[PDB]
């Protein structure tokens, strides 16, 4: 396996034409750590301070032939501990 590009099955997207709509969207992987580390709005909005974390990426292109769409997690790869768990595909940047 080449660990740069993930593969994501996003629910209720079952065909290739349905994947090209998502090229460019920003995926997220919302795992958590143990101790609470630094965070994007730290001390601006201290109520976000918590154990949860996220890794971000973008949807590079449809993989497969039915609803399957590759991903680039920017500058790195996702853990292999993420396989089979929840990835988040947002609706932005909107092309509409």
């Amino acid at each position: 396996q080449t660990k740069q590009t993930a593969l994501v099955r996003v629910e209720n997207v079952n065909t290739r034409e349905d994947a090209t709509w998502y090229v460019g969207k920003r995926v997220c992987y919302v795992y958590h750590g143990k101790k609470v580390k630094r965070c994007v709005r730290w001390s601006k909005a201290p109520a976000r301070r918590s154990t949860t974390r996220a890794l971000w990426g973008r949807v590079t292109r449809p993989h497969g032939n039915a609803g399957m769409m590759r991903v680039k997690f920017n500058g790195a790869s996702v853990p292999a501990s993420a396989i089979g768990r929840r990835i988040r595909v947002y609706l932005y940047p909107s092309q509409i």
């Binding site: 629910e11 209720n12 997207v13 349905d18 709509w21 998502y22 947002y90 609706l91 932005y92 940047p93 909107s94 509409i96």
Partner: protein, 137 residues
């Protein structure tokens, strides 16, 4: 070089928008102007319906729905790039009241869906089994 738009033509002033990110998620809101350079749009809802104040929202974080309003009765020119400079202020406080109160009527002048008011009071959730990628907007 002074003022021009590369903004998509499908996002005009007056188009109802669905805000995809930020403190206001899924609250629908009214696209009002584009700032002088390629700017963030200034969306406005009569805060009275949604709760969305006058804010900056760039093109890519929002969806522009096909339903517009007639905004030609609202004065946009009173929103410049300066009003957002420092970082409840009276200068900002009553800049709502001269738009929201000016915009509400421009809603009530519609026909055929004279009330978008109900439509502006709502949220856009993606519920299980939506597939928003098949939808028209």
């Amino acid at each position: 070089s002074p003022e021009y738009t590369t903004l998509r033509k499908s996002c005009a002033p007056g188009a109802i928008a669905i805000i995809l990110a930020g403190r206001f998620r899924g609250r629908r809101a009214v696209i009002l102007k584009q700032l002088p350079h390629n700017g963030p749009l200034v969306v406005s809802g009569p805060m009275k319906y949604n709760g969305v104040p006058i804010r900056r929202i760039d093109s890519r974080y929002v969806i522009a729905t096909s339903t517009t309003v007639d905004i030609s009765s609202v004065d946009t020119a009173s929103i410049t790039a300066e009003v957002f400079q420092r970082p409840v202020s009276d200068a900002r406080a009553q800049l709502q009241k001269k738009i929201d109160a000016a915009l509400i009527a421009a809603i009530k002048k519609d026909a055929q869906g004279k009330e978008k008011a109900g439509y502006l009071r709502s949220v856009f959730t993606v519920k299980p089994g939506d597939a928003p990628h098949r939808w028209n907007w």
